[PDB]
Design a protein around this ligand. Sequence first.
Ligand code: MNH
Ligand code: NA
Ligand SMILES: [Zn+2]
Length: 187
Amino acid sequence: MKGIIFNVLEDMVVAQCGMSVWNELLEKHAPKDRVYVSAKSYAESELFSIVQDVAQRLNMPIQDVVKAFGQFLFNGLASRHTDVVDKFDDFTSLVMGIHDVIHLEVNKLYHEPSLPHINGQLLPNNQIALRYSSPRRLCFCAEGLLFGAAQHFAAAIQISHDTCMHTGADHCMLIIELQNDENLYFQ
Ligand code: MNH
Ligand code: NA
Ligand SMILES: [Zn+2]
């Protein structure tokens, strides 16, 4: 798990809960003097432990917190990699380019990142079938990231997530419905 994910998580915790809370989390869940260098890889268990601790403090379902993080994360990533996001003029383009364009670039920017496998298929009625696969099972982070992307393009979406690795499949299916964006009028 790259430092950049931890750095965006810090911004979130610091913004919502305060710096004193982040330092608690970090002292408790990370080795002494840990510093997350944005480009370096770190044990994903440190990220999961921090986020689980937050979920418990807030008495929220863990996957609801991961999803909220995901949505915060989209802007954290777009603002730190603005040249990658500015390759797309709308939400649907970006989603269709996650694998072959965005995460292709992430392999040139970072040494050996740990990324999901994603394939998007355009459906009728302004829907997208996004297939997600990862041993890290962060499909709810992916839901949040899609909601973040929607907000980035002033779009409105809904997601159905009825095949899921957490319910025993070897992939998740996220069926994205684009309800509105700047190029959608009546239908
Ligand atoms: C919506 C769009 C979108 C989705 C659904 C998305 C999906 C994900 C998910 C889920 C993970 C966590 C790991 C896993 O195995 O699931 C992940 C990781 C990552 N992605 Mn992307 N990602 C972006 C946009 C997206 N990515 C953008 C924009 C950037 C920035 C250029 C980016 C860069 C990354 C980096 C960096 C990681 C972390 C890799 C690592 O920790 O080793 N990405
Ligand atoms: Na519109
Ligand atoms: Zn899932």
